A paper describes a structure:
In this study, we focus on KKT14 and KKT15, proteins of unknown functions that localize at the kinetochore from G2 until the end of anaphase in T. brucei. Here, we discover that KKT14 has a pseudokinase domain in its C-terminus, which is most similar to the kinase domain of Bub1. The N-terminal part of KKT14 interacts with KKT15, which we suggest to be a Bub3 orthologue. In this study, we propose that the kinetoplastid kinetochore proteins KKT14 and KKT15 are divergent Bub1/BubR1 and Bub3 orthologues, respectively.
By screening four kinetoplastid species (T. brucei, T. cruzi, Paratrypanosoma confusum and Apiculatamorpha spiralis), we succeeded in determining a 2.2 Å resolution crystal structure for the C-terminal domain of the KKT14 protein from the prokinetoplastid A. spiralis (clone PhF-6). Apiculatamorpha spiralis KKT14365−640 crystallized with two molecules in an asymmetric unit. Both molecules were essentially identical except for minor variations in flexible loops. Interestingly, a structural homology search using the distance-matrix alignment (DALI) server revealed similarity to a protein kinase fold with an N-lobe and C-lobe. The N-lobe contains a five-stranded β-sheet, a helix termed the C-helix (αC), and loops that correspond to the catalytic loop and activation loop, while the C-lobe comprises a bundle of α-helices. Although most protein kinases share a similar fold, we found that the most similar structure of A. spiralis KKT14365−640 in the PDB database was the Bub1 kinase domain. Human Bub1 was the top hit in the DALI search with a Z-score of 15.5, while the next best hit was the MST3 kinase (Z-score 13.0). The higher structural similarity of KKT14 to the kinase domain of Bub1 rather than other kinases is owing to an N-terminal extension that is present in Bub1 and KKT14. In the crystal structure of A. spiralis KKT14, W548 (the phenylalanine equivalent of the DFG motif, which is CWD in A. spiralis KKT14), strictly conserved among kinetoplastids, faces away from the active site. Similarly, in both the crystal structure of A. spiralis KKT14 and the AlphaFold2-predicted structure of T. brucei KKT14, the N-terminal extension makes extensive contacts with the N-lobe, which may stabilize the pseudokinase structure.
Numbering used by the authors: 367 to 640
Write the structure that this text describes.
């Protein structure tokens, strides 16, 4: 019944492979070639998620091949890969998730493989180069994705534009959103079934100022902050969301209310990025 006992038993049981790394075989992630387990990646770009004090990498699978996102967990008992897999099971995004854990359980890594399309951080869509209609389109899909997590009662707790990724397939017809660093995420239904309360030493409780994570309030405020970080804020509507005050109880319709006012224009996205 210990919080750690149940967290571990729960996330060891999810049907996603975790590859154990042997002493000496815990890579230092950086741009260039990285080998994790038997898997080789060419990391091309370093992403600095400054609000989370973390870095992430985007590259391709060994060969000029499949797009990938690679990053280290907060720690080797974060079960981040298992948390990201559970999350993937309820989103419409084509993603293969591989978890790697040091033999000493001290370090951890996640690789996520997408189909042969294009992968962009949400941050890319917030840059002042991007036309407004493309920016709004990405945020339109994010609204759907966060509304879907809200219904499932999964709270991410560390959402930023640097750790939300937009997958665009080779046709350019749509964006498919997958947030990534899930080390601190709250599966409220899972908690309730295993009889789990928050314990005072959880980075998630210290990081926010709360004694509990109850509902999607934290994720909704995260979403609103992303609107503050639009570098060419042209929309009075987007300006409105950036300054808005979060309702004390978050419901799916709070995401719907934002989504209804955003432009969906995949042609503007396609024209500027391809």
């Amino acid at each position: 019944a210990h919080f750690q006992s149940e967290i571990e038993e729960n996330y060891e049981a999810v049907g996603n492979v975790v590859v154990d790394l042997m002493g000496g075989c815990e890579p230092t992630l950086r741009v260039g070639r990285v080998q994790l387990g038997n898997d080789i990646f060419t990391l091309r770009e370093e992403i600095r998620a400054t609000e989370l004090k973390r870095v992430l990498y985007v590259g391709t699978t060994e060969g000029d091949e499949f797009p990938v996102v690679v990053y280290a967990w907060t720690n080797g008992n974060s079960y981040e890969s298992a948390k990201a897999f559970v999350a993937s099971q309820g989103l419409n995004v084509p993603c293969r998730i591989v978890g790697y854990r040091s033999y000493d359980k001290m370090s951890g890594y996640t690789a996520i493989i997408f189909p042969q399309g294009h992968v962009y951080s949400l941050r890319t869509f917030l840059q002042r180069s991007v036309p407004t209609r493309a920016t709004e389109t990405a945020l339109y899909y994010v609204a759907e994705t966060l509304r879907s997590l809200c219904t499932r009662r999964i709270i991410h707790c560390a959402l930023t534009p640097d750790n939300v990724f937009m997958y665009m397939d080779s046709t350019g017809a749509s964006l498919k959103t997958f947030p990534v660093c899930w080390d601190d995420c709250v599966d409220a239904a899972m908690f309730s079934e295993r009889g789990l309360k928050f314990v005072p030493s959880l980075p998630v409780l210290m990081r926010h100022a709360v004694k509990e994570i109850d509902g999607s309030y934290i994720d909704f405020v995260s979403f609103c902050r992303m609107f503050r970080q639009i570098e060419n804020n042209c929309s009075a509507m987007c300006q409105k969301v950036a300054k808005m005050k979060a309702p004390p109880v978050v419901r799916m319709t709070d995401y719907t209310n934002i989504q209804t006012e955003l432009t969906w224009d995949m042609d503007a996205v396609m024209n500027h990025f391809c």
